[PDB]
């Protein structure tokens, strides 16, 4: 990590900011199946 | 802002063209910066030899000799590792 941990910060929406950052298509999916359990 | 930059011309006089370089020791030109590796290797070997030789003495104890053996062994191991790595070009 760069000193001070970051040169950027993604849109923080859920408990997986990096997963949303790296896989934008999943963003809708992570919400659709969330409640199904 | 309340600081003035410094201009320094120290008299120089080995010319540092061989030995250590600024990339390794930034102030190589400003003072003695290189100790030949042979000096340190031989110093470590002689320190280990002295530790081993101190086993011969007027002490009925044995943990003393074992401590000497351990310290001499680690010194020799460090010297051997350094020498081997430098022989191979700092590999492994």
């Amino acid at each position: 990590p760069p000193r001070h941990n970051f040169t950027e910060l993604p849109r923080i929406r859920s408990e997986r900011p990096a997963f949303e950052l790296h896989y934008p298509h999943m963003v809708e999916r992570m919400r659709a199946e969330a409640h199904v359990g | 802002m309340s600081s003035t930059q410094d201009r320094s011309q120290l008299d120089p006089e080995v010319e540092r063209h061989t030995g250590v370089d600024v990339e390794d020791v930034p102030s190589a030109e400003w003072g003695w910066s290189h100790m030949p590796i042979g000096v340190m290797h031989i110093g470590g070997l002689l320190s280990a030899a002295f530790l081993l030789v101190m086993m011969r003495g007027n002490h009925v104890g044995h943990v003393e000799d074992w401590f000497l053996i351990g310290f001499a062994a680690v010194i020799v191991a460090l010297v051997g590792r350094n020498w081997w790595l430098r022989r191979r070009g700092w590999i492994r």
């Binding site: 910060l9 849109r11 923080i12 | 309340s2």
Partner: protein, 139 residues
């Protein structure tokens, strides 16, 4: 800081309940009445969490919703001047060494090494605290 305060409020509720029930069930149904050690410890950990939660609640009511607390908060919203975070400093190791010299003086009952460790600790804490306030040397 609503959630930060509410966490400690929940802890306070639970610890107060634990202290009360322990005190009651130890005053009665125990061999020698109130235990007086567990009871006090539970009461004052309730106090710990109560102090922290009360301060957090005061701050939550004093401060408007921060970006951190606000869902749907953009990074630009919080972007700005973060405060002073201390850069490199070698005073912490000196403080630790001074406190260790006081601790060994306490262990090995050496009043002279306690006295010096404490002096050492005062000096190093002064250095740490004054590190970023010692004005330029005035000659």
């Amino acid at each position: 800081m609503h959630i930060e305060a509410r966490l400690f409020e929940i802890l306070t509720a639970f610890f107060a309940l634990a202290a009360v029930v322990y005190a009651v069930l130890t005053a009665m149904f125990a061999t020698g009445g109130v235990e007086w050690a567990g009871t006090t410890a539970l009461v004052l950990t309730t106090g710990l969490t109560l102090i922290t939660g009360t301060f957090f609640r005061f701050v939550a009511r004093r401060l408007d919703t921060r970006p951190e607390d606000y869902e749907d908060a953009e990074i630009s919203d919080g972007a700005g001047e973060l405060g002073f975070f201390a850069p490199h400093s070698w005073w912490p190791i000196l403080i630790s060494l001074s406190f260790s010299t006081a601790a060994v003086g306490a262990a090995l009952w050496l009043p002279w090494l306690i006295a010096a460790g404490v002096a050492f600790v005062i000096t190093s804490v002064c250095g740490l605290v004054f590190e970023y306030y010692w004005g330029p040397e005035k000659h």
